[PDB]
Every structure is written in structure tokens, then in C-alpha cells.
Design a protein around this ligand. Structure first.
Ligand SMILES: C[S@@+](CC[C@H](N)C(=O)[O-])C[C@H]1O[C@@H](n2cnc3c(N)ncnc32)[C@H](O)[C@@H]1O
Ligand SMILES: C[S@@+](CC[C@H](N)C(=O)[O-])C[C@H]1O[C@@H](n2cnc3c(N)ncnc32)[C@H](O)[C@@H]1O
Ligand SMILES: CC(=O)NCCc1c[nH]c2ccc(O)cc12
Ligand SMILES: CC(=O)NCCc1c[nH]c2ccc(O)cc12
Ligand SMILES: [Zn+2]
Ligand SMILES: [Zn+2]
Lengths: 345, 345
């Protein structure tokens, strides 16, 4: 990718070099270079950043300089010295104090997904995930592999909640959910989406439903409101909480059609006339050929779960088969879209 | 990176998702999807590609669809079926038969560099490479870690030669080398650059100098011309071949200043009045803040070797200290640039 070379060659190098750019961003997060800059009295030199993050003078310099070129950081010259500062981008998304922080998700991508992706050819060859070949941990029970340790589980929970600080409003306000006074977030993790949901619908109440170890770490690590309640269990076998609306955010994409049909049938059979199901997923274009981000997300499900990303028609087949009617969707213009279907008589 | 969201958020996801895009390209190469399409009588459906590469129908489909979105492949509809074909880009750079093939380099990046990069935070913290923490192999002798096995050595040799099919002419014709009838490529690997050099300068002769195991695999795996000769040895201790011009392509970037000064002093002391040194490296902008590709390449030297990328001034310091004069450089507009310096009286 030399300035004077063929557009195709330049594009090819961009693609090839993508993993280096991803890891510069992940490493900057992992070392906390953005937080140190936000906690600083002004801009910092290379020696200061290096000292404050316990890293090399040579290593730090290179990292800061790439961040500047990537427009993650800004640099100013004072005397014979470069001083670094945050951008609008890093302040809004790469600072732990920021409410729209994307830090934890980026750290998970670099420590977890990145490794899995190193075995992509094999996942493509086998049509299955690579936890065993990557971490030496079996995935016969998906979430035993995903929650490898207490540490891994917390990181996963901190990671996933972050998108809702930017995407939450569009998915919950796509349809008017004020018709469902009592709600249940099936596989709600730490309860970030339910916390968002409760501020938008003040006349509602919600129960966050997840596996016992998740419910425990949620109560133990994430602070709590008056409208949010918890229930531990397995949604494939246990009695589900009574609700007018069951929310399924990034649950269906973890599983194959059959497993999906099973959970959907259980929810249907628990619903009452007029009850609803709100599926929050990144919708794939009808020709499965876009959006590129969603396509990459489907391949990550090949590598990280037992599922895939799906087209609106595919969700309609699944939901119709379970017994739901009045299927509707809304493309938000964001990663995450919203589907609402209902139970009749 | 939803179409309707903030430019900064979209850019952040691009960066974050870069490793997925890199591995889609590496995996496509590793499975030989481009070669199968070039060897096909026409365009192929998903079932055909899947069968021809021994992979999943689901896995293959996703890979082909991402390649189409990345503009690596083109798709056409016939009946109720997608048929895939190569682009100008994949035909020129991703086909093993093509002379400008970049396949081997991409395979090395995905199998070798990609893994090393997973330990970037640590390389930045320690200021040293990660062969031990990645492959469990010590790097106290750099090239013993780089040539982990017979297999790894061949892959490295096939990988590195590829850039010269696009960049070779600019580096060898930057200066008129017809003044040096007898040449030596120090650390010339398989001899791709020397083969390029011999077609450009028909009145010249060249000796490719590398470590015994490299010289062996070069004679054993790469086919040979009448102007090219080989010499095995260690350029830090052994008698160098007699030449009017010593070529150092991507050698100096592997080592620290001191080691560089040592080899440079040896070459200087072997040269005769009017003799020359041709350093072929990716030059860093004077403020070390670009080009981005070169910056990423310097960080890869932190992770993969004992060196870094350097600015023209830095090469001038090194070459002047060794005794060379008449320092000149030429930015080609490509990844690889050229430096020429001379020995006086
Ligand atoms: C992909 S995460 C999504 C979390 C959250 N809804 C979001 O989008 O951020 C899937 C959730 O389903 C939970 N889960 C998986 N299997 C479950 C089961 N059998 N019963 C209850 N919860 C389960 C996991 O613990 C995890 O919180
Ligand atoms: C980065 S590779 C570059 C190969 C080639 N010049 C190119 O740019 O494609 C560095 C070369 O130096 C060789 N090398 C490393 N140490 C050496 C030594 N002490 N003596 C001779 N060759 C050496 C390696 O075997 C390798 O071929
Ligand atoms: C890249 C991507 O798939 N992001 C979505 C969030 C995410 C990352 N890893 C996961 C594993 C399971 C899951 O249900 C969601 C995620
Ligand atoms: C990404 C990059 O640094 N490309 C340059 C070619 C290349 C890849 N790995 C290497 C290790 C040592 C070296 O001397 C050159 C390379
Ligand atoms: Zn039923
Ligand atoms: Zn000397």
C-alpha cells in the first residue's frame, strides 16, 4: 500500500494489515493509555505514558504514533517534544469513566475472539466452533466453554453490556412497549438492557433471567433499580417468569434452528393472548450478502457459538412455527435491529 | 457500524473488526478458493467450492459472501443459485499461478504474525518479541525461532519473495546499478530479488549470501539463472563474497543499532574505493508518524525480530558511522524504497 501503487494492491494490504490495527486498539485499551490521558492534568509525553502504563519507551512511542495516524489520538509539539491527548472518539468510547465506553468489549475481542479467529480455516472446514483447539476447553455445553473461569465470565458480562449505551434506545423504542406492563429479559446478562428499558417505560417492571453463575456475578459486580428483579435458571427446562413481553437480545444467534424452535415453543406456551416476543438481533440483508459487519458477526457465531446471524424471513419462519403472529421488524440504522411478534387466540 | 450512526462509532468498529477481515482473506488463501475458481471451467456455486476445498456448506457460503462484500470476488445469479468468480484483484494477487501472487505472504501473516500479535500488549510492555510465549520456542538466536521447523523456513522463504514481483523494479532501478558489474545480495533468501536484478542488468553477476539451511532450501525448492551464484555463511563472522555492490534488503530492520553497526563496518571494510551499499527498506517519515503501513511494519519488528523501521536520517547516521559517504535515497511511492551510499579514499 504505497501511495503511487494500484488501487487493488492498496486495498489488499489494508485487508492483510487489519489484524495489526485491531490489536493496536485492543492493546491501547488493555494498557489503559486513554484513561491515563483523561486522568492527566493536560497532554502527556511518551516517557509519561510509558511510565504511567508500565511499558517500553520504544513500544509506547510506536503505539501512540499509530493511534495518532488512526485518528484515535491527537498530537501537539511543545519544545522538542510530542505531547498526546484524547480525541472526541477516544473520550466518548475508550474511557472507562464514559457512559458510552466500548473498552470491555474491545478487550474481550482481543483476548477471546481474536484467538478463536486464528482457527477460522478449521471452523470453516468443520462447521463448528474451536474452543477445544484454542483454549483446550471442550464446548459440548456451549456456556461452560464461554465461561472458562470466574474471570472470563465477568469479562464477557462487562463486554456485552456496552453496546446498549449507544444502541439500547433504538431497539426498545422501535415499537411501543408500554402495552406490556410486566417484562422478562431472557438471557439478560448483567441487566444493562433492562436498566435502559426501565428508564424508557416508567410504568413497567422487568425480571432479568439468566443461568445461576451469571445472576450471582450480576448481583455481586454490577450496582442496582427499584423496577429490576432477578431469576436464575435454564430457559430450556425451568419455569419462566410471568410476563406480558419476553425479550430475547442476542440469544437466538447462539443456537441452531432446532434449539431456537425449542425455546420459542416454550415461550409461546407460557404467553397469554396479546403477549409479545421482542427479538433484538443484527438483521442480515435478504440475500445474506450484507451488511458486512453483520456478515462478520455470523462467522464469529460459527467460531464462538452454535448459531449464525439470520434474515427477517428466517426469524419469521422460526417465530411463525412456534405459534407467533403479527411479525414486524424495524431496521434502526444501527448494528442491532428489533423484531416484535404476538400470541393470538 | 450501522449506516445511520456517528462517523466515530463507525470508524471504531472498522478498526475493531479488522482482525476478522484479515482472517477471511487468509482463510480463503489457506483453503485455495481463488485457485479452484481459476481452475474451474466457469463460475462455481457454494456446493462446488465447498466440495473442491473440503469445507462446510455453511462455512464456505459465509466465506464467499464476505469475499464478495470485500470486492475480492464477484457473484452472478443463474436460476435460483449464486455463482462466484474471481476479480482482477484476486486473479492478479491471490492465484498461485499468477506471477504477482501474494498468497504465501498472506498465509505466513495469518499463521505466524497474527499469533505473535495476540501478545502485542506484552511485547509493548517488555520491549521484546514473543516467540517463547506464542510458540514455546526461545528467540535468544533470532533465526532459530523464525525457522522453528523445515516447514516454517520454506513458508517464510515463499512468503518474502512475493513483494519483489511488484516492488522489485522500482528499488533496483531507483539508481543506475550498471556501474557495479559484480553484486552480492546479503541475506537474499530464495534469490527472488537477485533474479529480478539479473534481468534488469544483463552485464552484471550476483552472489546470493544466506545461512546454510536457507541456501540448501533455495537450491532444493526454488528453480534456477546463469548469472546467479550462492554462498552460505554468517555475515556477522564469515568472509563475505567479493562484490562492487552489497545489497541489504530487509536485513537492517531485523536488528538493533549495535548489530547493524557491526555488519555495516564489516561490509565497509570489505568494499573497495567506489564500491556501494544498496539498502532496501520501507522508509519511515522523519516524524516517525507515517506511513501507517510502515508504522505497523515497525511494531511487527518489535513482535517478530530485534529491530524496527527507520527514518532516512537514522539510516544516514548508521551508514556514515560505518564509513560510507554520498548517502542518497529515493521514495518509490511503493512499500519498499531504496538507499545508496559509497566507499571513498
Ligand atoms: C449472547 S449473551 C446476550 C446477553 C444480553 N441479552 C446481551 O445481548 O447483551 C446470551 C445470554 O444467554 C445466557 N444463557 C445461555 N444459555 C442459557 C440458558 N440455558 N438459560 C438461561 N440463560 C442462558 C448467557 O448466560 C448470556 O447472558
Ligand atoms: C528479512 S529476511 C529478507 C530476505 C530478503 N532479502 C527479502 O527482503 O525478501 C532476512 C534474511 O537475512 C538472513 N539472515 C539472518 N541472519 C543471517 C546471518 N547471520 N548471516 C546470513 N544471513 C542471515 C535470513 O535467513 C533471511 O533470509
Ligand atoms: C463480534 C461479535 O459477534 N459481537 C457480538 C457480541 C459478542 C462477542 N462474542 C460473543 C459470543 C456470544 C454472543 O452471544 C455474543 C457475542
Ligand atoms: C508485516 C511485515 O513486517 N512484513 C514484512 C515481511 C515480513 C513479515 N514477517 C517478517 C519477519 C522478518 C522480516 O525481516 C521480514 C518479515
Ligand atoms: Zn406448540
Ligand atoms: Zn571501521
Amino acid at each position: 500500500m504505497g501511495s503511487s501503487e494500484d488501487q487493488a494492491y492498496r486495498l489488499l494490504n489494508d485487508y492483510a494489515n487489519g489484524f495489526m490495527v485491531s490489536q493496536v486498539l485492543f492493546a491501547a485499551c488493555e494498557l489503559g493509555v486513554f484513561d491515563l490521558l483523561a486522568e492527566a492534568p493536560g497532554p502527556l509525553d511518551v516517557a509519561a505514558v510509558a511510565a504511567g502504563v508500565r511499558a517500553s519507551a520504544h513500544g509506547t512511542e510506536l503505539l501512540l504514533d499509530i493511534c495518532v495516524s488512526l485518528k484515535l489520538l491527537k498530537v501537539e509539539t511543545r519544545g522538542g517534544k510530542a505531547f498526546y491527548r484524547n480525541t472526541e472518539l477516544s473520550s466518548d468510547y475508550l474511557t472507562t469513566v464514559s457512559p458510552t465506553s466500548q473498552c470491555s468489549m474491545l478487550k474481550y475481542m482481543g483476548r477471546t475472539s481474536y484467538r478463536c479467529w486464528g482457527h477460522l480455516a478449521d471452523a470453516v472446514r468443520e462447521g463448528r466452533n474451536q474452543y477445544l483447539e484454542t483454549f483446550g476447553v471442550p464446548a459440548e455445553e456451549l456456556f461452560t466453554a464461554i465461561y472458562r473461569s470466574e474471570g472470563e465470565r465477568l469479562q464477557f458480562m462487562q463486554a456485552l453490556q456496552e453496546v446498549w449505551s449507544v444502541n439500547g434506545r433504538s431497539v426498545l423504542t422501535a415499537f411501543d412497549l408500554s402495552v406490556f406492563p410486566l417484562m422478562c429479559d431472557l438471557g439478560g446478562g448483567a441487566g444493562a438492557l433492562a436498566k435502559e428499558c426501565m428508564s424508557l417505560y416508567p410504568g413497567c417492571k422487568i425480571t432479568v433471567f439468566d443461568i445461576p453463575e451469571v445472576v450471582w456475578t450480576a448481583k455481586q459486580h454490577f450496582s442496582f433499580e427499584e423496577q429490576i428483579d432477578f431469576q436464575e435458571g435454564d430457559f430450556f427446562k425451568d419455569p419462566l417468569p410471568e410476563a406480558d413481553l419476553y425479550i430475547l437480545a442476542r440469544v437466538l444467534h447462539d443456537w441452531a434452528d432446532g434449539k431456537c424452535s425449542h425455546l420459542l415453543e416454550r415461550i409461546y406456551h407460557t404467553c397469554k393472548p396479546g403477549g409479545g416476543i421482542l427479538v433484538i438481533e443484527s438483521l442480515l440483508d435478504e440475500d445474506r450478502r450484507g451488511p458486512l459487519l453483520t456478515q462478520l458477526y455470523s462467522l464469529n457465531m460459527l467460531v464462538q457459538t452454535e448459531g449464525q446471524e439470520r434474515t427477517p424471513t428466517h426469524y419469521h419462519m422460526l417465530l411463525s412455527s412456534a405459534g407467533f403472529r403479527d411479525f414486524q421488524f424495524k431496521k434502526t440504522g444501527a448494528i442491532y435491529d428489533a423484531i416484535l411478534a404476538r400470541k393470538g387466540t
